[PDB]
Design a binder for this molecule. Structure first.
Ligand SMILES: Nc1ncnc2c1ncn2[C@@H]1O[C@H](COP(=O)(O)OP(=O)(O)OP(=O)(O)O)[C@@H](O)[C@H]1O
Ligand SMILES: [Mg+2]
Lengths: 301, 150, 333, 192, 7, 132, 168, 380, 7
């Protein structure tokens, strides 16, 4: 499970089961997902119909950037008003379905990817801003540093879904950049994340992955670019990382998976830290078994 | 019942073993002979002939009843006069030596090794290895069986 | 000076209980079981196993004149076995009044009593009381603040020495009036009452073993301090005219004895015995008793109790060792 | 621990391993720390079938379950406190003579370290209940417990001695006669 | 028993 | 990456006092080239420096020029590597062990001691020579 | 004096084989028992002098002798934090697997890295020179395998980064 | 941080069940199985995934067996997989409620506490038993306060079963009584029975079991419905049909008719001995609220059979005592209940409990383990 | 258990 999933496997399985079947059930359950977000799967009125609800911490900052447009573009035949706050809701009718064709699985997958669906309008806006800025530079190749500087702090966005973990982004001349500011509580986990980030930095040296985007990082001091944001800065435990992508890296046929990967970056990092801990434990048990063999050799009989 | 660690009955025996000649009131309760012999070793170091200084300093030895400043100064002068020696003549010095002298030497070497930040311990390990290769494990087992305080 | 290993003895021995004809013997196995071996054709075999105790044993002894056997147990008890007219045995218990476990036992040269040094602060001396069918034990507890490690007898039943846990080795008497024994005016003391604590002769380190020369004088003892001392007293109360100590480089040693009024032998943690001459003018070791010093010698572990041979009561001319790794061996001289 | 002996058999084997590998803890906290910190105290015991098992803290714990009935499920003070209260319920002039003479009987009393542990527990209970923290006069207690290798058959030896003593007079006994008349009531002649 | 002596 | 990881894995396990030299000559001729600078991964380079300072401090019997060879292959490493430009990973313990082996050199010995002391003081004359 | 490792090793080996003169002993405390006196610490006459050796403040080897058992504590050199964590985890797991060695200790003494323990039954069943040789080989292979584990973790991180950037 | 919803996990020899709190039904239930094989060899799977695997060369093994952990490495791998793939949760911002058998040892308890506090950097943790939670899942409302606490729980795990006479939220440590039956042994017996006559292995066995296995007040007085009406010879198919015969009629009787497979004592006698060993002033209540648990216990007429047997036994004993005395006593009333909870009562009770705010306080904090170590919890 | 009541 190296590449984590970009959706909710529980919701996907529940939808595939309810749709493929006909027998309904009075469902009322809650689920947790990364970034401290909540899901509700209620079925108060009709055992067939379902009322899904999504609660996130940065929903106001997100809608400020504009997300309802994307939601009503991808949905609208199933949208619903917030039954009780929860920061987002949606309704579905288990009976009035299109068909059992692959459209059913596509709709189930789209519903399961609601998190990254609602967390994609900022990146779409950035790409559009980047595209129009590049078009402008085409009719005005001069003033590249000037236009880049005046675009800085103009076309720039930030998200603080977490208490301290933040994601900022902005485009520039024929490329875009994003920055993750994260926190490390345990010192062992901090050192492991530091070495992982160093390896990430020294990963593009491989020729087979030269086309990958570029990455840099800092331990406590953040770059002067985003030094003015309200987000906490100059923290020994708060580590900053910066990705920079070029035009191709966000192509009309891969930007979806690109944003999903950029989203699951941190979860993948933490899971791989823990998996590396388990790997070290495996090596330790192997070596102590070798030591036991040596000691038994030393022992007679 | 309860747990109170009853020990007043059947008292242990600590001072019975490790006979104590501490009843002298000279160089152990007043620190006179130590202060008379340490400048001699210092002058021996200054002039260069540190072997005779070490030999004269090894004549008398304190005990570990209650005082530690005098014995720490003794061990410091010891480490000094030892570091002031070259990497040769140690075999001859140990061959022309007694047994109790070697035992006290090893005991002081260990007491010095107990604090590496304040000394070097490399020349100390070298001297210990040479003494072992010359005399043998007898000195180590004798010092390990000496008084618990010194 | 001739390595003559006899048997393997898989489990540890800690004793050998030799016999008079060097035919049979009795040893331990670090367990409640005690093995009586008999001489097979150019070999040996487990002729019998006692397994009468419950806890492990620590020492045994074989009284020749009575063909008797004595054994102690960590269970705070002792057993005594007599060779019945048939090949079987007759066992009897000895509930020596104690509090802690036993550590060592040894018969008296006259085979009339046996002494037992226990793990407590007390030694005991037991004798089969006539007019009855049991044994009576008497205590010695005033000296010996701490536990003890070993003990040894004297030509006469009196003047028994004890190597203790402290850095000193004591000497007391086991004289009794109801028994048919009487002391004798000796340099070690006069009128020899029951306790008659005579000397202490402190030394360095533990006291693993002691020893009496074939004469009543010239005591010796060695322990964990890799040193052996010999005392040639002149008067009971006055200090000894000479107390000669001898230190060496080899590891500590135990279970020493006398191969002559002047020569002394001993072994122990050192995987090979030694040979030294102890005289009033000086005591010193001359040579070992091996090709040189698996391992490059006979034994390969701690050497346990070492016993003498017949020879002559003056000079034994040979002895036996039984290491903790079995491999019982005899050495000439 | 994982090993199960649910069969009606193996009860004798468990009894043998108990009587073979068991001992009271003179210092329960010390033994617990030792078992938790060191690999020693762990023994390997064979079975008649052939397999082997490992034993640990249970060795020094079962004498505690003997000492602490609440651990087993019974509501009682124990053994040391029990005998202490029993003696305190007597007259003062007898108490001393009881602390100076204490005997045991039964194979269950042969647990290693039981006598000295009981003596220390009695000393601590006295120190607590009576002196309340005054060790100035504690040494003046003079407790002397008794133990021997024949506690396994002390009852038998005593029965034999009493039979040899009373074999002369038949009045103290209850003959086969005078049974049909008031036999049951004859049994009340022993315990008033 | 609870009389600090007898009983 | 395979080359560097295999080399460091073999050096961490090897014990021959002569075979390590060949690998040391390979490391020297590899680092001396400027195009090869920073080819070794940072973490790999950090653990390499760690094992270097280790084998320097706990060096085997003095009857060996392994110390001289290690100093000779180390003096050009820090000049054409990736740990040169950023805050150095470990230099305090490096110079500490260097000074230790320097004072440990009996200057009254043969020309080997003089050569080793010269190479050491050459190592100590690093451009930055950052202190405290 | 350079190459202090070999003199330090010879000295620790000599003192260990010297103090390794154990012998059967029955506890004089409660009844017919056999406990490690060096561990219980209730008999000063049994406890010998505690010896210590060290080539530098970053490393130390303490040894406590007795007649029934012996304890040998060691604190290994560790300057980095990752090294400290790796050493702690490795030694903790090894001590957890302290059933096949018969000598390890489940928990160490405060202020040191690990503490081996030996008793009389061991030297009677198995030998002692091979035991000390194994102790030494472990004293070196501890740091050897710490380095090897750091290398393996670096390789794992590199593989993770490669697969991540390729799936990107 | 004690404010979010706590995660409820329950591992088992037969099925691991994990989900969240404040839910009427559990989540992520699956049979607790793992499957595995520059070079990492980390590709593994668990649950239904691992079950469907092994066709491409993936090995298989059961981490926990006989009701006791065996391989902490695979257990940690399983927990990591289930926590980072199935549930997209964060172990730091959520409290954990783990369950362990009453026989779990302190070594395993502290090993789990450490591997959870250190590797997963959790914040709040609480380890409990299955008896109290299964009992709490008995009552329906849980707020009227007219509920009862004194009960005698019997949990039949898929690997091992046991019985606990709980009294007023105070678990007992002596009257506990285990038994290695009422698990996969029944499946193995039904399989050996089927493999004798009809060669067409264990999947179909457990399927037909959960489908039709039922009990009967008797067997020899029974067997008559079989001799008379062949309708009982149902036809189950997976891939063809199979003759059920009398497995559905004999399998569950293994409890009331022990010593049929790999001796033991029937369940009524066992629970009677348990109640007797317990104090006397709690038996009147213990015999009253006898709740069940475990899938293997949710049979057709289990409750009626057990109630009848225990009632007749107690009535015979009390009648003996009465006819010995001569008076007339008040016949104790024995009852049994299982209200749509014996299947997964453990998770329901755990969630109902965690719903209280005192859970956040009764849990263990990370700083506690940091300062005290892995010696926090020793025993119930 | 065999006391006709308790135990
Ligand atoms: N309705 C039913 N009637 C009888 N038996 C059933 C029924 N449903 C399930 N079972 C049995 O229960 C078993 C599953 O038990 P389950 O996995 O719930 O126990 P568990 O809670 O995992 O126990 P543990 O926690 O000790 O592993 C199956 O093997 C099946 O035979
Ligand atoms: Mg279960």
């Amino acid at each position: 499970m190296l590449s984590l999933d970009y959706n909710n496997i529980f919701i996907y399985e529940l939808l595939t089961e309810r749709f493929s079947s006909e027998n309904p059930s009075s469902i009322d359950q809650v689920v947790t997902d990364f970034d401290g977000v909540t899901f509700h799967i209620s079925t108060p009125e009709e055992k067939t119909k379902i009322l899904i609800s999504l609660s996130m911490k940065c929903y106001p900052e997100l809608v400020n950037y504009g997300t309802l447009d994307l939601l009503k573009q991808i949905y609208g035949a199933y949208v619903h008003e917030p039954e009780m706050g929860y920061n987002f809701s949606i309704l579905i009718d288990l009976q009035q379905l299109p068909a059992t064709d692959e459209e059913k699985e596509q709709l189930a997958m789209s519903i399961s990817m609601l998190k990254r669906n609602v967390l994609a309008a900022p990146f779409h806006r950035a790409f559009t801003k980047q595209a129009e800025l590049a078009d402008l530079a085409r009719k005005d190749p001069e003033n590249a540093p000037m236009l880049d500087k005046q675009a800085t702090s103009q076309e720039l966005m930030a998200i603080h879904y977490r208490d301290e973990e933040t994601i900022v982004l902005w485009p520039e001349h024929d490329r875009v950049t994003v920055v993750f500011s994260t926190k490390f509580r345990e010192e062992t986990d901090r050192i492991f994340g530091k070495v992982f980030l160093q390896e990430f930095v020294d990963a593009r040296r491989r020729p087979a992955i030269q086309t990958a985007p570029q990455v840099l990082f800092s331990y406590r001091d953040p770059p002067l670019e985003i030094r003015d944001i309200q987000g906490i800065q100059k923290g020994d435990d708060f580590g900053f990382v910066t990705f920079v992508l070029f035009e191709r890296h966000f192509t009309p046929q891969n930007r979806e998976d690109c944003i999903s990967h950029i989203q699951v970056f941190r979860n993948t990092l933490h899971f791989h830290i823990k998996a590396s801990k388990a790997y070290m434990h495996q090596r330790m048990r192997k070596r102590v078994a070798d030591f036991q063999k040596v000691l038994n050799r030393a022992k007679p009989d | 019942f309860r747990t109170l660690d009853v020990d007043s009955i059947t008292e242990p025996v600590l001072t019975e073993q490790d006979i104590f000649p501490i009843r002298n009131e000279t160089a152990e309760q007043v620190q006179a002979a130590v202060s008379q012999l340490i400048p001699q070793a210092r002058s021996a170091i200054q002039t260069g002939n540190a072997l005779q200084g070490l030999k004269t300093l090894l004549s008398y030895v304190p005990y570990g009843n209650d005082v530690q400043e005098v014995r720490t100064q003794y061990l410091n002068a010891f480490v000094d006069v030892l570091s002031n020696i070259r990497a040769a003549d140690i075999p001859a010095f140990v061959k022309e030596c007694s047994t109790e002298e070697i035992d006290n030497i090893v005991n002081f070497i260990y007491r010095g090794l107990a604090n590496p930040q304040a000394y070097n311990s490399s020349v100390l390990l070298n001297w210990h290895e040479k003494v072992v290769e010359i005399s043998g494990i007898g000195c180590i087992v004798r010092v390990l069986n000496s008084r618990p305080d010194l | 000076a001739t390595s003559q290993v006899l048997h393997i003895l898989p489990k540890p021995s800690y004793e050998h209980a030799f016999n008079s004809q060097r035919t049979e013997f009795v040893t331990t196995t670090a367990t409640n079981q005690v093995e009586l071996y008999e001489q097979d054709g150019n070999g040996w075999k487990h002729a019998r196993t006692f397994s009468d105790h419950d806890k492990i044993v620590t020492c045994v002894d074989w009284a020749p004149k009575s063909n008797r056997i004595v054994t102690c147990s960590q269970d705070r008890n002792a057993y005594v076995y007599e060779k019945r007219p048939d090949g079987t045995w007759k066992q009897t218990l000895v509930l020596l009044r104690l509090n802690r476990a036993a550590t060592f036992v040894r018969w008296s040269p006259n085979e009339d009593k046996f002494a037992v040094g226990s793990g407590a602060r007390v030694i005991s001396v037991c004798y089969f009381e006539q007019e009855n069918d049991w044994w009576v034990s008497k205590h010695l507890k005033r000296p010996l603040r701490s536990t003890i490690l070993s003990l040894d007898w004297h030509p006469n039943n009196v003047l028994l020495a004890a190597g203790c846990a402290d850095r000193k080795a004591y000497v007391l008497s086991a004289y009794v009036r109801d028994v048919d024994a009487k002391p004798e005016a000796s340099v070690w003391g006069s009128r020899l009452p029951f306790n008659t604590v005579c000397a202490e002769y402190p030394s360095g380190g533990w006291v693993h073993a002691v020893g009496f020369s074939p004469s009543g004088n010239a005591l010796a003892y060695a322990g964990h301090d890799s040193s052996v001392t010999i005392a040639y007293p002149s008067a009971p109360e006055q200090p000894p005219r000479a107390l000669i100590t001898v230190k060496l480089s080899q590891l500590p040693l135990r279970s020493l004895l006398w191969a002559n009024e002047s020569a002394i032998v001993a072994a122990g943690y050192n995987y090979s015995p030694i040979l030294l001459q102890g005289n009033e003018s000086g005591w010193a070791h001359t040579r070992d008793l091996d090709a040189g010093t698996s391992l490059p010698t006979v034994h390969q572990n701690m050497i346990a109790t070492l016993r003498p041979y017949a020879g002559t009561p003056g000079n034994i001319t040979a002895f036996t060792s039984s290491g903790t790794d079995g491999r019982v061996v005899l050495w000439t001289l | 621990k994982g090993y199960a002996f649910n069969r009606t058999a193996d009860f004798e084997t468990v009894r043998e391993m108990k009587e073979k590998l068991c001992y009271v803890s003179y210092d329960l906290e010390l033994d617990h720390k030792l078992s938790e910190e060191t690999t020693v105290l762990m023994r390997n015991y064979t079975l008649p079938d052939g397999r082997v098992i490992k034993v640990g803290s249970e060795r020094y714990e079962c004498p505690e379950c003997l000492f602490q009935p609440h651990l087993v499920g019974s509501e009682q003070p124990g053994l040391s406190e029990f005998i202490f209260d029993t003696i305190q319920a007597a007259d003062v002039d007898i108490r001393k003579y009881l602390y100076r003479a204490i005997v045991l009987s039964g194979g269950s009393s042969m647990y290693a370290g039981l006598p000295s542990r009981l003596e220390k527990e009695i000393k601590q209970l006295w120190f607590e209940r009576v002196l309340h923290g005054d060790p100035a006069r504690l040494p003046n207690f003079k407790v002397k417990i008794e133990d021997a290798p024949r506690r396994r058959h002390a009852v038998f030896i005593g029965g034999a001695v009493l039979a040899d003593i009373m074999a002369q007079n038949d009045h103290m006994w209850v003959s086969k006669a005078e049974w049909e008349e008031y036999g049951v009531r004859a049994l009340d002649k022993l315990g008033p | 028993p609870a009389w600090l002596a007898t009983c | 990456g395979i080359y560097s990881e295999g080399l460091v894995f073999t050096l961490n396990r090897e014990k021959d006092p002569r075979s390590r030299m060949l690998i040391l000559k390979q490391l020297f001729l590899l680092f001396t080239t400027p195009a090869t600078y920073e080819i070794f991964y940072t973490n790999d380079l950090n653990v390499l420096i760690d094992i270097f300072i280790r084998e320097i401090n706990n060096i085997p019997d003095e009857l060996s020029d392994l110390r001289y060879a290690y100093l000779q292959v180390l003096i050009p490493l820090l000049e054409n590597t990736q740990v040169r430009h950023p805050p150095h990973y470990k230099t305090k313990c490096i110079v500490d062990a260097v000074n230790n082996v320097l004072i440990s050199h009996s200057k009254s010995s043969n020309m080997e001691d003089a050569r080793t002391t010269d190479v050491a003081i050459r190592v100590l004359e690093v451009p930055w020579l950052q202190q405290e | 004096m350079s190459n202090t490792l070999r003199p330090y090793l010879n000295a620790v080996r000599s003192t260990l084989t010297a103090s390794l003169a154990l012998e059967e002993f029955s506890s004089e405390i409660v009844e017919r028992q056999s406990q490690p006196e060096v561990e219980v610490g209730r008999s000063p006459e049994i406890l010998l002098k505690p010896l210590v050796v060290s080539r530098n403040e970053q490393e130390q080897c303490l040894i406590e002798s007795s007649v029934n058992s012996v304890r040998f504590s060691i604190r290994i050199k560790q300057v980095d934090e990752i090294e400290r964590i790796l050493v702690r985890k490795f030694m903790q797991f090894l001590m957890g697997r302290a059933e096949s060695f018969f000598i390890l200790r489940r928990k160490p003494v405060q202020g040191y890295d690990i503490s081996f323990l030996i008793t009389n039954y061991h030297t009677e069943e198995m030998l002692k020179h091979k035991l000390v040789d194994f102790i030494i080989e472990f004293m070196e292979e501890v740091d050897a395998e710490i380095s090897e584990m750091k290398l393996f973790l670096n390789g794992r991180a590199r593989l993770v980064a490669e697969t991540y950037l390729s799936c990107f | 941080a004690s404010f979010n919803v706590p995660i409820i996990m329950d591992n088992g020899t037969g099925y691991s069940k994990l989900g969240y709190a404040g839910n009427d039904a559990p989540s992520y239930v699956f049979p607790t199985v793992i499957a595995t094989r520059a070079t990492e060899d980390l590709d593994f799977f668990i649950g239904n995934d691992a079950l469907k695997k092994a066709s491409a060369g993936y090995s298989l093994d059961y981490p926990i067996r006989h009701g006791q952990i065996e391989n902490w490495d695979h257990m940690e791998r399983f927990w990591q997989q289930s926590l980072f793939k199935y549930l997209r949760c964060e172990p730091e911002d959520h409290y954990f409620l783990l369950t362990e058998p009453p026989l779990n040892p302190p070594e395993n308890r502290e090993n789990t506490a450490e591997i959870m506090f250190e590797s997963f950097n959790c914040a709040g943790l609480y380890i409990a038993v299955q008896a109290v939670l299964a009992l709490a899942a008995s009552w329906t409302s849980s707020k009227v306060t007219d509920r009862s606490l004194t009960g005698t729980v019997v949990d039949s795990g898929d690997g091992v079963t046991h019985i606990i006479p709980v009294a007023e939220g105070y678990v007992i440590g002596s009257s506990i009584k285990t038994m290695p039956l009422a698990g996969r042994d029944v499946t193995y017996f039904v399989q050996s029975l089927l493999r004798d006559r009809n060669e067409p292995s264990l999947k179909t066995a457990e399927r037909i079991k959960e489908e039709c296995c039922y009990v009967c007040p008797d067997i020899v007085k029974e067997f008559s419905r079989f001799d008379r009406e062949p309708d009982r010879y149902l036809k189950y198919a997976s891939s063809t049909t199979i003759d059920v015969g009398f497995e559905r009629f004999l399998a569950p009787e293994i409890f009331f008719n022990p010593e049929i497979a790999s001796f033991l004592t029937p369940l009524p006698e066992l629970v009677d001995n348990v109640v007797q060993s317990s104090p006397i002033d709690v038996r009147k209540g213990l015999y009253k609220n006898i709740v069940l648990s475990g899938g293997s216990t949710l049979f057709k007429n289990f409750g009626n059979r057990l109630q009848r047997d225990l009632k007749r036994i107690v009535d015979e004993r009390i009648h003996r005592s009465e006819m010995l005395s001569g008076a007339k006593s008040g016949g104790v009333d024995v009852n049994v209940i299982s209200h749509k909870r014996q299947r997964n009562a453990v998770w329901f009770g755990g969630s109902l409990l965690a719903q209280t705010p005192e859970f956040g306080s009764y849990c263990h904090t990370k700083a506690d383990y940091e300062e005290y170590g892995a010696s926090i919890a020793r025993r119930y």
